[PDB]
């Protein structure tokens, strides 16, 4: 599914974004923009063994079992495959996970290069929630 | 299937240190983030800390200062050590995944002379 | 730090009727309230993560409900091996922190 920045914003405050560990929604908006425009079904193919997977395209060698990843650590305790619903669940589940390690949301290289430093708040701007 | 197994002393002289150890099985110590928590008399929890995998540590900040916590990939464990004891510490401790899922047994730890 | 506050103190049941357990939040924390039961001489058991997603092989007579600063643990049709303790527990500000805790006992 190709989610609206709106309806994202809406689904992701359900899902208990906004204000976890510190990081504003606007954060979670942006990363999931410039990670895969929003796109639940985004995959990409690295270079190493591994994939990256749904809508915050986290990576396999790390976070997710896929079966075919030399290294995998599965940080997350699931199939790569749970990371491509509709369903954001498991994604957020994940992504909370990540984000409580020391290295907080510089994990997302997109968020890096395209959020960190700027305002994320302008993400969030102009939706009703 | 992951099993934490705690060890250490049951008794611990005022001033000195509280160490206990958490042994897992099924799961990588560097493959997971591990807690500590402990349980005094009242039912009353409090949450000590957090070691993720890339070895950041959290720590309650009322422990700030006296806690430690830290990992042997190696012997698969991971470590709690907490000093300067007083009877304030006297607790039931459990070691657990963050994810809350995996416990240990708990293990009473008295603070007396 | 956030605070968690549990209500009520004390559950007294009638077996085969279902009950409602409070967790109020000093503070805004979305859904990042855990629940969980521990009984004498046994290790916390997690009931529901996440205010409301299901944690696999627990009954489904628990369920978990709320958001913000209000969230509630439903149990239908409480059997008497639910006695013990129910705590909740925040994860969305470090210091995590869990509530006081209700004791389920059972009525007779």
């Known amino acids: 599914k190709v989610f609206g920045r709106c309806e994202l914003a809406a689904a992701m405050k359900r899902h208990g974004l906004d204000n976890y560990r510190g990081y504003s929604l606007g954060n979670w908006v942006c990363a999931a923009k410039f990670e895969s425009n929003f796109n639940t079904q985004a995959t990409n193919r690295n270079t190493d063994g591994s994939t990256d997977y749904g809508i915050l395209q986290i990576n396999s060698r790390w976070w997710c079992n896929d079966g075919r990843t030399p290294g995998s650590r599965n940080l997350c305790n699931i199939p790569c495959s749970a990371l491509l619903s509709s369903d954001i669940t498991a994604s957020v589940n994940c992504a909370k996970k990540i984000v409580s390690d020391g290295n907080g949301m510089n994990a997302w290289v997109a968020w890096r290069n395209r959020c960190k430093g700027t305002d994320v708040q302008a993400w969030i701007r102009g939706c009703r929630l | 299937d992951v099993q934490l197994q705690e060890s250490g002393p049951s008794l611990v002289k005022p001033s000195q240190t509280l160490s206990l150890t958490c042994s897992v099985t099924?799961?990588?110590?560097?493959?997971?983030?591990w807690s500590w928590i402990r349980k005094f008399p009242g039912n009353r929890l409090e949450y000590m800390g957090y070691?993720?995998?890339?070895?950041?540590?959290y720590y309650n900040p009322s422990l700030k200062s006296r806690i430690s916590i830290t990992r042997d990939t190696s012997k698969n464990q991971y470590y709690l050590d907490l000093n300067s004891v007083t009877t304030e510490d006297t607790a039931t401790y459990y070691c657990?995944?963050?994810?809350?899922?995996?416990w240990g047994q708990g293990t009473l730890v008295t603070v007396s002379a | 730090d956030i605070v968690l506050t549990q209500s009520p103190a004390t559950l007294s049941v009638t077996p085969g009727n279902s009950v409602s357990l409070s967790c109020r939040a000093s503070q805004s924390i979305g859904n990042n309230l855990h629940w969980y039961q521990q009984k004498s001489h046994e290790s916390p058991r997690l009931l529901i993560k996440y205010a409301s997603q299901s944690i696999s092989g627990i009954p489904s007579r628990f369920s978990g409900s709320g958001s913000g600063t209000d969230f509630t643990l439903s149990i239908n049709s409480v059997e008497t091996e639910d006695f013990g303790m129910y705590f909740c527990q925040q994860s969305n500000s470090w210091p995590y922190t869990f509530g006081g805790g209700t004791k389920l006992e059972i009525k007779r």
């Open positions: 099924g799961d990588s110590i560097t493959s997971d983030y």
């Open positions: 070691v993720s995998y890339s070895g950041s540590t």
């Open positions: 657990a995944n963050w994810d809350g899922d995996y």
